Symmetry: C3
Subunit: 214 residues, 3 copies
Amino acid sequence: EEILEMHGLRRIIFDKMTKAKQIMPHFTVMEEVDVTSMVSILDSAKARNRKVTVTGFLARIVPSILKQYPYLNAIYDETRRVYILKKYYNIGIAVDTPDGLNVFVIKDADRKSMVEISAEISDKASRARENKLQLDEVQDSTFTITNVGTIGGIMSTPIINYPEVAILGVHRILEREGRKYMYLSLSCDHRLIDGAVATRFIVDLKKVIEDPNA
Amino acid sequence: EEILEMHGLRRIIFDKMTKAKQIMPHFTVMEEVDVTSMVSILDSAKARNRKVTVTGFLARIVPSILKQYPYLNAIYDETRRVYILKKYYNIGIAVDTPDGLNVFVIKDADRKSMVEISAEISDKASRARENKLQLDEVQDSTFTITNVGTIGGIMSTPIINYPEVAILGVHRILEREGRKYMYLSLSCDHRLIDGAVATRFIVDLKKVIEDPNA
Amino acid sequence: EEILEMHGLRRIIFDKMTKAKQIMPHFTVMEEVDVTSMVSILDSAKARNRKVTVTGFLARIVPSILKQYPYLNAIYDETRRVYILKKYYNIGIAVDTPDGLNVFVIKDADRKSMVEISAEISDKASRARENKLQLDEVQDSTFTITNVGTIGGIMSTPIINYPEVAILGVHRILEREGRKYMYLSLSCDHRLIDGAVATRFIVDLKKVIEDPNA
């Protein structure tokens, strides 16, 4: 066998993790979403004004509900028993780059329209692959979203990006009967966030992918 | 952006949850259940009787299945080595108060009718929203159950209330095809609760909800 | 109320699990699989070929796909600094004993046929539930599987057999359309197995169960 060691980016992502759930107890909850009301909304706009990705539409909605539920847009400090509830919203996006999993951020997401946020993730991801991305662009994720759906998968239990307080898992689309379905999940620090309040969050969010007309 | 320090109640959970998935490695399972037979025994004793809730119900069945699966109801102590299994089954239950989440214990659930159990849940739940609960009433839980199935959600990897040795996760009543199913989840310390002996229990339970004609 | 502490097997697993989800942080993804082609492939081969098990079938394909993601067939280490990816494929498949859970290795599995495999898995099994098993047959698992779908449960968050770096949960099969599906959960270490690769693995498994023919 060939023993192989640890890298830079690999040593980072190793470390982020060994710590993330060294000190954040993970709770994870899910619902499903009648995404048919969603799915077509991109297809009509993928018709005129490419693009809006699935990643891209979600990041559009997610902030305005973290607005109602503040406990989820927050950070975990080393002053120990402490807080940082961030009022501004820069959301993280986990992408696969040939070296290892890289998180980056959408500058004030609660400001950007559908297309912009989607043109940006396009801008940064292929730039994230060619490993030419900059110090400021990977920093200050108040919250973060992980899509596996462009590969596959029903539902996962993702590990929260430290030191945020919450992460959200996008997955593959379904087709139950005869509507378009998809499972979403939520993982969080089960101390700064209850059971109930994590779930109360996903339903208010679900309701705006349920009703994009709201 | 805002700050602050860890609160009385919130801090008790903070510590409890860190010392939860800090000592106890988590294993969770999910089994689907047909609650159709259940739903209408809810709707029939909703009218000619009253109460007997989605929660208040399960609390009635669980203590007897724990009579068969002894490993599931014991609390984990100070000393490593030791386990202590308990022969007296009172279940704790997960109510969200305004002051943070709570766990009260309807005692010896094996000697109270679905009605008492579902009065006692609401009796105590109503007072839990004023933390006007007695220190006595929130004690000694051998097992615990948690209902987001009021607020929403189809699936969970929940956190065992420490020092108990497992937990059960109640969810939303999805209607697939023409009958009613809700997913259940059970997490537990996989040090004494094996791969099988977890599934074996939630598989034995799956029966009891799937025919309350028992 | 009964003390009862720790025995032989109980100690080996307790200790093995305490330390498992104590170093290795646990990310896990689920995929649903159309096993109708598999299931009918069993029954045509059961009416005449004595074998093959749900396990053993899965087990045959497993090493094939580890030969495509080098990372999942690996085992963690002493001094932190190291990782050792394994090149031969020995799949440890875990069944029940009377004392608790056991794991044993169906060794160099990429060579053996589905009939070959399933005869071995059922052999070592009835042995291990008699605790009549060699130090030999419990050697170098490069990768672990856990079928509780013989008991029930659509899914679980199975914890990786230490220090192997991936695991796979096998589950209860349910009829939908009604076609035939079950869920496939793969847990693993999130230090190496980035999100995308876990999924990229269990879409790459999901695709083989669905097309056993090309």
